[PDB]
């Protein structure tokens, strides 16, 4: 409530900021590679289908 | 030749993302991380008000 | 003594808010995995796929199912949990005389959302049935997380009142 | 009214300050998440609506 | 495609914050927090005058 | 490794009658390799999700 | 209380606008298909056509 | 007059800002569509009369 050793609200704000940062990182990768599923991590079956089709 | 063209077009439809939507998603995510950094900087300061009481 | 005893009630209420926060933090992952499994079943339902793409979607479906079971079993806060179904209910302090603040557990394990540990589709018709199966499971999961969030809100209001 | 052991008015000012603190915390969280229904703790029914439609 | 765009617009209308209202609410809530802190600092001093009587 | 995808270090074709079977052999090897890579990517995504939860 | 009740009214009006929007997004397709069907019936109204084209 | 809880001028400016935003959105729609009656929502009498003459 009134804590000096810890501030939970700042931690929640950090979780929100980290989520926005991961979203912007995925957007940067999607922009620069030109692909929504550039690698197997993005989606396994879809990437395997794209690779076998290629 | 037509079959290879259709196959590359299908691979593109299956893996390539549309780009115009990320063209706005990028700017929105930049504004969003900026607002999140501002909110976190505001959240860091709330505990420190207690010092005025002492 | 009646005034001094309320610190334990406050501690129990905020401990309950913490455990429901852990349950919601696991339920986010459970909901995202349920959405991915719904997309996998809905993609496998198409007949146009060859056997290889169908087997790949089946493998990702089983993998996300195991990941959902792991995220469900990992959701606990100092040995107690509202998501794994280990106990029917937790009783938090609310008065000087110790009358409980009930917070019924809402199971989020695969068996508690209707899926089995070995649930999977084997052909396009089974995948088409699995679309509705995963949809009903996602619906009951969202209802359970909503009930847990309402209970956490009641914990917070009762903490302010205490 | 006269009192060294306790002062009710300071307790009332503390209750109002804690209410303002919870308000500012919910507000900064609404700013940094980009949503007024960030989770089920905000409101469970509307959030289940948003998650199912999403 | 129009269906998915419409569902995204609807979920956003269900969730997206009135951020322009949130800026004013933030700018007011920080002032209210500082006023509450100063009011508590004044409330702490009220019974301390008793020592002047002795 | 070659042994794990059904190939061997001695694998080759002595004539076109064997190259026609090597075609399907390399196809099955590519299939199992893409499947194993997709499983590795799914495992990495699961590790990232459990990391965020932790 | 009457002011706080209005948020549900605004949410319902937004949901109704989204429903009307998806309805018109379909209705454009109904209108274009109806235009194609009128063109087809009008082309088939000719007596000069052979059985195959009709 | 002065108050930390409510400032009417911020609300009024936000309403004028929403009005100019809505007019700007309608203008951008008239530009990207190239039509003064892009859809049934814009103007139904001209819309239906034009769809039938076309």
Automatic annotation (TrEMBL), chains A, D, H:
Specify the domain of life of the species encoding this protein: Bacteria
Task: List locations, semicolon-separated.
Answer: Secreted; Bacterial flagellum
Record's subunit section: In C.crescentus, the flagellar filament is composed of multiple flagellins of 29 kDa; 27 kDa and 25 kDa.
Q: Which family does it belong to?
A: Belongs to the bacterial flagellin family.
Q: Main role? A: Flagellin is the subunit protein which polymerizes to form the filaments of bacterial flagella.
- The identity of this protein, by name, is Flagellin
Automatic annotation (TrEMBL), chains B, E:
Q: Which segments constitute the Flagellin C-terminal domain?
A: 1-54
Enumerate the subcellular locations listed in this protein's record, separating them with semicolons: Secreted; Bacterial flagellum
Q: What does this protein do?
A: Flagellin is the subunit protein which polymerizes to form the filaments of bacterial flagella.
Q: How does it assemble?
A: In C.crescentus, the flagellar filament is composed of multiple flagellins of 29 kDa; 27 kDa and 25 kDa.
Q: Which family is this protein grouped under?
A: Belongs to the bacterial flagellin family.
Protein name as annotated:
Flagellin
Question: Which organism was this protein described from?
Answer: Caulobacter vibrioides (strain NA1000 / CB15N)
- State the covered range within the intact protein: 218 to 271 of 273
From TrEMBL, chain C:
Write out the GO cellular component annotations. Answer: bacterial-type flagellum; extracellular region
Is the keyword Thylakoid assigned to this protein?
no
> Which UniProt key words apply to this protein?
Bacterial flagellum, Cell projection, Cilium, Flagellum, Secreted
User: Which ranges does the record mark as transmembrane?
Assistant: none
Q: Residue limits of the Flagellin N-terminal domain?
A: 1-88
Which superkingdom is the protein from? Answer: Bacteria
Major site of localization recorded for this protein: secreted
- Single Gene Ontology MF annotation: structural molecule activity
List the signal peptide residues.
Answer: none
Q: How does it assemble?
A: In C.crescentus, the flagellar filament is composed of multiple flagellins of 29 kDa; 27 kDa and 25 kDa.
UniProt family annotation:
Belongs to the bacterial flagellin family.
Q: What does this protein do?
A: Flagellin is the subunit protein which polymerizes to form the filaments of bacterial flagella.
Report what the protein is called: Flagellin
Name the gene for this chain: fljL
Q: Which residues of the full protein are shown?
A: 56 to 217 of 273
From TrEMBL, chain G:
Q: Where in the cell is it found?
A: Secreted; Bacterial flagellum
Assembly, per entry = In C.crescentus, the flagellar filament is composed of multiple flagellins of 29 kDa; 27 kDa and 25 kDa.
Protein family according to the UniProt entry: Belongs to the bacterial flagellin family.
Summarizing the function annotation, the protein's role is: Flagellin is the subunit protein which polymerizes to form the filaments of bacterial flagella.
Name of the featured protein: Flagellin
